[PDB]
Design a protein around this ligand. Sequence first.
Ligand SMILES: O=C(CCCC[C@@H]1SC[C@@H]2NC(=O)N[C@@H]21)NC1CCN(c2ccncc2)CC1
Ligand SMILES: O=C(CCCC[C@@H]1SC[C@@H]2NC(=O)N[C@@H]21)NC1CCN(c2ccncc2)CC1
Ligand SMILES: O=C(CCCC[C@@H]1SC[C@@H]2NC(=O)N[C@@H]21)NC1CCN(c2ccncc2)CC1
Ligand SMILES: O=C(CCCC[C@@H]1SC[C@@H]2NC(=O)N[C@@H]21)NC1CCN(c2ccncc2)CC1
Lengths: 121, 121, 121, 121
Amino acid sequence: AGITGTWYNQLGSTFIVTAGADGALTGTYESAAGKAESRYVLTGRYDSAPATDGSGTALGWTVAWKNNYRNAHSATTWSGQYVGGAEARINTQWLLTAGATEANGWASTLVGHDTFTKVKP
Amino acid sequence: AGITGTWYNQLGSTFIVTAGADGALTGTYESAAGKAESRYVLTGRYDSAPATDGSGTALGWTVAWKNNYRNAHSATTWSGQYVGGAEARINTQWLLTAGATEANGWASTLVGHDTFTKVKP
Amino acid sequence: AGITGTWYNQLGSTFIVTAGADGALTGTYESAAGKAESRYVLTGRYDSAPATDGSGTALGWTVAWKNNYRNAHSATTWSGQYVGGAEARINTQWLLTAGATEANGWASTLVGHDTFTKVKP
Amino acid sequence: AGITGTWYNQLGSTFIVTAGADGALTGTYESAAGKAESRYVLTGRYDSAPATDGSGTALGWTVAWKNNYRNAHSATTWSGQYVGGAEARINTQWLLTAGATEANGWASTLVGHDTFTKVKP
Ligand SMILES: O=C(CCCC[C@@H]1SC[C@@H]2NC(=O)N[C@@H]21)NC1CCN(c2ccncc2)CC1
Ligand SMILES: O=C(CCCC[C@@H]1SC[C@@H]2NC(=O)N[C@@H]21)NC1CCN(c2ccncc2)CC1
Ligand SMILES: O=C(CCCC[C@@H]1SC[C@@H]2NC(=O)N[C@@H]21)NC1CCN(c2ccncc2)CC1
Ligand SMILES: O=C(CCCC[C@@H]1SC[C@@H]2NC(=O)N[C@@H]21)NC1CCN(c2ccncc2)CC1
């Protein structure tokens, strides 16, 4: 609950998601940063029966950075939680892995953090 | 290509995945570690047109740790790449976020790394 | 340059550091969160000849969470960069590893992100 | 205890460290990968009174990638634990931050994992 809809991160990226009744996330992602253009498919999962003690709702999703316009040979996963209320948020940390040869595998993965809100910066 | 099927990590967990023609990952995950029992739904994405220079194929997927037997109020995302050949591998790093109150949010996310192979340890 | 002094993160923790001329960081850390009390020794390194193109200055430091009052059998490393100017910042991501047995090693490491400023929240 | 000496990771890098009696780590690092040449100064911290229940000993250290031969405008922190015994190990995860402009800050940090042993691969 509260997850379905449009979310914006601190970079200005747009996350459009539908949370299905038994834990599915499905939607599109449009990144304001990096080797990206237009919308990309996403899919993920969320806890559809979270705790009732004030804790957030755990979730995650993946984008592979290939669409009809661009292929960046990479994929990002966001892991985080939804925190409801008047200033609802999805707080995440992410891992972006790029395809790499063996010699470059050590340097294949970026890490960061995105904060999503219902009204953009 | 090469991704569909069963994979095993260094903990003995079992990852069963179908890679669809236009980038979908769908399947089940059974963890040998942590607050888990039996299979959980997963979904993710992969680069369906990887580079041809020897690089791996970028991918990611998510498990929310709720099924009919157990809810651990948490979700893991694996970000990594498939590397084909006689000793094929999926090399990943992962983020596990647990639902948390505001006071505990700083401590909500574990990080680690899993190596998947087609024949178990 | 610009690094020496007192910094505060979003949790209210206090980072007191001296940046030595050839790349040393030395000081104390006081955490507002977790299994911590009073000051802990830190040491780290920074790039003492950063780029002049507007890029930040790369750095990192470590705290082991043992002092005369408390031992949390753990250590945090912060990796990030100093960004100078009127609203100077040290932007970091961190890894906290706790001592663990073999069975619990997979769950030994937390990840997060701290933003330090010269005037507290 | 057991930490002082020379360690080798899976890339063939050489970590030479002295663990001082009250928690200091001091030494040199020579990387077999990336924008590195010869030895770099490191400093870090470790838990000098670990648990006695079979748990490892938490530690961390930092290298800034500047020496007399090369400056890669970046720093790596390793966070992990020492596990003693006949096949002693230091198991780590690391964060490498590169100096970045504001527009590139999102992409400033790599993550990975290194396993150190007392006899090289
Ligand atoms: O730029 C993209 C694709 C778009 C990513 C957008 C990112 S997702 C997390 C963050 N939040 C957003 O909203 N937007 C950004 N992909 C690159 C990254 C850099 N690459 C490498 C290669 C080798 N090693 C490391 C990195 C090459 C591929
Ligand atoms: O144990 C699980 C669910 C099963 C995870 C299994 C993990 S997935 C990555 C790794 N690879 C595998 O194959 N198996 C393991 N969930 C916990 C974790 C610890 N928890 C917290 C709470 C607060 N902060 C931090 C952590 C509570 C919830
Ligand atoms: O709480 C502390 C020591 C203080 C850490 C303070 C942290 S440093 C990053 C952040 N920024 C700050 O300013 N303050 C916080 N240590 C614990 C953590 C949880 N622990 C485990 C055990 C097993 N697996 C995972 C985690 C047990 C030991
Ligand atoms: O290559 C180095 C310095 C040597 C690092 C060696 C690494 S330490 C962890 C691992 N374990 C080892 O033993 N060896 C390797 N530095 C780069 C990295 C890539 N860079 C960027 C820039 C912008 N964003 C992301 C990354 C530019 C600077």
